[PDB]
């Protein structure tokens, strides 16, 4: 099956605006005396210093 007609701007945008990135939950951590912000699931690794902070 092929598109019968081109979508209007409105219909294309209504669908397309729903393609967005999932926001990551971020929490504050303090390792080595300095503050940083990391995803919550990576807090354990952040405290063990296993997270390259860039």
């Amino acid at each position: 099956a092929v598109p019968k007609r081109r979508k209007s701007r409105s219909n294309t945008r209504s669908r397309r605006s729903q393609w967005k990135a999932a926001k990551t939950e971020l929490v504050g951590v303090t390792v080595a005396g300095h503050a940083h912000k990391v995803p919550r699931r990576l807090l354990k690794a952040a405290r063990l210093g296993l997270i390259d902070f860039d």
Binding site: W19, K20, A21, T24, L26, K37, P39
Partner: protein
């Protein structure tokens, strides 16, 4: 109304739509917060955009001489650059068209309380 700095990353090799997907997470936040979200966003476009905000913040602090801590990405937007054109062979002798889309990413940060 607020002192500001601009950075542009021109002809960056990411689709404008994917760049927009990753900048909609950081539009309007502080520079430090935006850099953290982009650090932790799995989307590959987060890299280039992150260094665009970093460059804008650096311009603000070095050329503008203003405080990095009070700095917010006021307006970030990705528009389309030139698109390269490639041919991908398909079945039965058809040749389809691939588009290498590039982006121009503009960031304006301003300093404000």
């Amino acid at each position: 109304e607020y002192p500001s700095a601009v950075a542009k990353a021109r002809f960056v090799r990411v689709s404008p739509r994917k760049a927009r997907r990753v900048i909609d997470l950081v539009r309007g936040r502080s520079v430090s917060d935006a850099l953290d979200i982009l650090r932790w966003a799995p989307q590959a476009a987060s890299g280039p955009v992150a260094k665009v905000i970093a460059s804008a913040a650096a311009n603000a602090q070095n050329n503008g001489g203003l405080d990095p801590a009070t700095l917010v990405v006021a307006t970030v937007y990705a528009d389309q650059g030139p698109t390269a054109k490639r041919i991908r062979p398909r079945a039965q002798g058809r040749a389809f068209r691939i588009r290498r889309r590039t982006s121009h990413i503009t960031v304006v940060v301003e300093s404000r309380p």
